[PDB]
């Protein structure tokens, strides 16, 4: 009963949080998933969601100075990490001397003027003072989905990629990564609220008090985010 428009990044994470969300409180969640940017605009539009898991933190602000937004409704729901990866287990070495070293062709980022973790991508490659050279190179999906499909097709030979992503029992579980330490780019604060259509919708309250509890907290960090 609950439409939530959610951030690609947290695809997996939502399509297992609904699994025990229809268990526990019987309402079931519909998601559909893309960029942060683009859910903006489908909702300025009039998309039926009710819930909104951005990427970031200023897109929510931004659309409650518009109008779209519950007041008090607001939260952090999840902190991502960012990762450089490849599939190939030698090719990204453990502290990031490829983007410095290597000899690749397309390093794979989500759209930076859509996707939250494209922009934290260019804040990285800026603060590392890598951007001149590796902005010829870059190759951007639709969505941090998009952008990783690309590495693990074979379209490109790296990408920066969500935790979310690699990451399984406390891990990145397969290929080769460099986790991007934090200074190189704002913190990944992602930041739910409910939408002006969700105000008062049993399933909706139902599910952003749900987000906040034991289940959705313990599987939410087994992707790798920080709460
Ligand atoms: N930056
Ligand atoms: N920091």
Same mark, same amino acid.
């Given at each position: 009963e609950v439409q939530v428009a959610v951030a690609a990044n947290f695809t997996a994470p939502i399509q297992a949080i609904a699994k025990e969300f229809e268990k526990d409180t019987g309402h079931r969640l519909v998601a559909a998933y893309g960029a942060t940017g683009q859910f903006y605009t489908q909702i300025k539009n009039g998309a039926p969601f009710? &819930?909104?898991l951005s990427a +970031? +933190? /200023?897109?929510?602000?931004? #659309?409650?100075q518009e109008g779209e937004v519950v007041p008090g409704s607001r939260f952090? $729901?999840?902190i991502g990490t960012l990762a450089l990866w490849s599939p190939?287990?030698? $090719? &990204? +070495?453990?502290?990031?001397e490829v983007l410095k070293s290597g000899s690749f062709r397309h390093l794979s980022i989500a759209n930076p003027k859509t996707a939250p973790y494209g922009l934290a991508a260019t804040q990285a490659m800026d603060? #590392?003072?890598?951007?001149?050279? #590796?902005?010829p190179k870059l190759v951007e999906g639709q969505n941090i /989905? *998009?952008? $990783? *499909?690309? &590495? /693990? /097709?074979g379209?490109?030979? #790296?990408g920066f990629v969500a935790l979310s992503q690699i990451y399984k029992d406390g891990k990145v579980a397969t290929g080769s990564a460099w986790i991007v330490p934090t200074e190189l780019h704002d913190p990944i604060? *992602? +930041?739910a609220v409910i939408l002006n259509k969700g105000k008062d919708n049993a399933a909706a309250k139902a599910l952003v008090d749900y987000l906040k509890g034991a289940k959705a907290a313990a599987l939410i960090k087994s992707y790798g985010y920080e709460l």
């Open positions: 009710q &819930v909104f +970031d +933190d /200023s897109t929510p602000a931004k #659309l409650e952090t $729901y999840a190939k287990a030698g $090719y &990204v +070495d453990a502290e990031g603060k #590392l003072g890598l951007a001149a050279t #590796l902005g /989905s *998009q952008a $990783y *499909q690309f &590495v /693990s /097709s379209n490109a030979e #790296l604060r *992602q +930041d």
